[PDB]
């Protein structure tokens, strides 16, 4: 598989890894999203330490309004974060 | 780097491997997109062998209608392809 | 170690994670096999929830007729599931 | 994905890596199998140098006569090496 | 660095990792040796569950009688274990 | 496999890569030992350029008097060289 | 990621481990640089315990005159130390 | 060893692997430097396909003018790349 293909499997893996911890095994609840952001995105995002911050992140990602982040919402989240960090190269 | 962050860097790297070939070095033109798909997504997608199919993929991805795929749009494509793969893994 | 070499070791390690829980530490009994499948093959296989399903899985895997799955029989099951997954990535 | 599920995908991945280089993209020809063994099994197996050795491994693995190793045949190879490794280790 | 030189540094590093956990930072006391064996040699050695067993392992390794395993003593243990592994090719 | 276990296998691997050159493929003769030192211990040890230096190393290592270095004897050489290197990082 | 790539990220990570303790989270004040040296270079460098050694090291590393060590400046320190280590292995 | 110590040994190791191939075994000639960048900086850097690219990189790094990069000069390059990576993660 190419490196791009392996990158896509890794996105699915990390999602499974956190979404399967608690409750709904196919979505991230606020707590799981907090742990994903803090443990897996520490070079791209500041550590989330206040519930207002977890709440706004989740409010932003949660387009179906169920209070959780499903896989499609997580892919959009990754797209936003990666797009943002790639703007570094856009000058 | 986490495996998530490595995936994110891979996505940026592969995008540029193809985007910088011609014209705007931060967008994929149709020829660059065709090559990316054919060389980097050979296990997940059918090889593109017809200009018509190339036009249709770009028409689908090109959300801002500038005729090219920028990195935001490329992320949306990756998310679509990832999604297809993720379906295989929910049982 | 290469990714292949680590993968071979991971197959050994998972077999023993389960085989050593109960009874003979070198074989998977039904309950161990059910737990391995349910916990470690959840994205590749439907969860096993009924004794009758467990029984038929063991019956296919248990070639030598001792009522359990030994390492070699487990390697055959791994080759079966892997071949199934490999049929996916054919393009 | 579990460690087991990752290990299965890593088997598919390495197969692809070598099978797609030359000729039939869905099979390892002798040179492709040689490379895979020398680059990816370079801690479990001795480097294959002599052609005769390459020839013999392929004859071991090639069950359908076509002179190449397909994925199914490669999985039987993987089981052979994993078993050898299993016998190398302690389990008590 | 060759694969041999890198192996050597890895041996130094694992000894460091465990020798620094309690007491004398340069030696493995019995608890530290038990943990290294159980955490880092799980594919080559039986897990140690009994104190008799780790006392016996240390008695064997402990050539200067201080009741701990220093690095030179650790290298000897590594030599024994690797030589035993190698018996697989005998 | 742990880094320590990886190390142990590397040690077996290099020994065989040299021992297998000539004569007994399970032992290092003087020429093979010289080559191992010069090519694999180039950063820990001064290059051997003198027959007397070779002779001396082998006399030190060879404990069963066959005039060669088997694996067990090589492990003793490894212990010795590593130990000397460790003390160098010592507080 | 290659070993080189992972090593570069490890440099960023240890820097931040100590840089974020106090004050500017993006620079090392002398107390922080001291602790970094004392805790993460314990096998390469003798412990610093005198004001003047810290003062001396910081004056060497400080090129923009803020009395702190930013990440670029830290990289000159890393270069110095590593070059020093490389010289021990060249013999 | 700490993560920082191992990172430092990794930097010296990668230098040894590439500097050893051709000519002066203690320095990187331009072909060696191209190989290192293409093989070891492949996730962070663009592939060098145009010879004028290593030519200009060497131009900057060579400060004793043997037209090659020694370890010292190599560390400056590692600073430059690592610093860019830091700024990239700095958003
Ligand atoms: Ca959940
Ligand atoms: Ca939602
Ligand atoms: Ca372009
Ligand atoms: Ca567009
Ligand atoms: Ca059992
Ligand atoms: Ca059976
Ligand atoms: Ca082929
Ligand atoms: Ca090898
Ligand atoms: Ca065949
Ligand atoms: Ca201790
Ligand atoms: Ca002792
Ligand atoms: Ca020999
Ligand atoms: Ca002998
Ligand atoms: Ca600070
Ligand atoms: Ca400063
Ligand atoms: Ca050179
Ligand atoms: Ca690249
Ligand atoms: Ca120079």
UniProtKB/Swiss-Prot annotation, chain E:
Ca(2+) 1 binds at residues 19, 22, 24, 27, 32. GO terms for molecular function: calcium ion binding; calcium-dependent protein binding; identical protein binding; protein homodimerization activity; RAGE receptor binding; S100 protein binding; tau protein binding; zinc ion binding. Ca(2+) 2 binds at residues 62, 64, 66, 68, 73. Small zinc- and- and calcium-binding protein that is highly expressed in astrocytes and constitutes one of the most abundant soluble proteins in brain. Weakly binds calcium but binds zinc very tightly-distinct binding sites with different affinities exist for both ions on each monomer. Physiological concentrations of potassium ion antagonize the binding of both divalent cations, especially affecting high-affinity calcium-binding sites. Acts as a neurotrophic factor that promotes astrocytosis and axonal proliferation. The modification Blocked amino end (Ser) is found at residue 2. GO terms for cellular component: ciliary basal body; cilium; cytoplasm; cytosol; extracellular region; extracellular space; intracellular membrane-bounded organelle; microtubule cytoskeleton. Pfam families: EF-hand_1, S_100. Disulfide bonds: none annotated. Residues 13-48, 49-84 form the EF-hand domain. The keyword Cell membrane does not apply. Signal peptide: none annotated. The modification N-acetylserine is found at residue 2. GO terms for biological process: adaptive thermogenesis; astrocyte differentiation; axonogenesis; cell adhesion; cellular response to hypoxia; central nervous system development; learning or memory; long-term synaptic potentiation. Although predominant among the water-soluble brain proteins, S100 is also found in a variety of other tissues. This is Protein S100-B. It is found in: Cytoplasm; Nucleus; Secreted. Keywords: Acetylation, Calcium, Cell adhesion, Cytoplasm, Metal-binding, Nucleus, Repeat, Secreted, Zinc. Zn(2+) binds at residues 16, 26, 86.
């Amino acid at each position: 598989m190419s490196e791009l293909e392996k990158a896509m499997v890794a996105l699915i893996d990390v999602f499974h890894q956190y979404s399967g911890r608690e409750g709904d095994k196919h979505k991230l609840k606020k707590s799981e999203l907090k742990e994903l952001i803090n443990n897996e995105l520490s070079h791209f995002l500041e550590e989330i330490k206040e519930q207002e911050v977890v709440d706004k992140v989740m409010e932003t990602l949660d387009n179906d309004g169920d209070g959780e982040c499903d896989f499609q919402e997580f892919m959009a989240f990754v797209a936003m974060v990666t797009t943002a960090c790639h703007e570094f190269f856009e000058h």
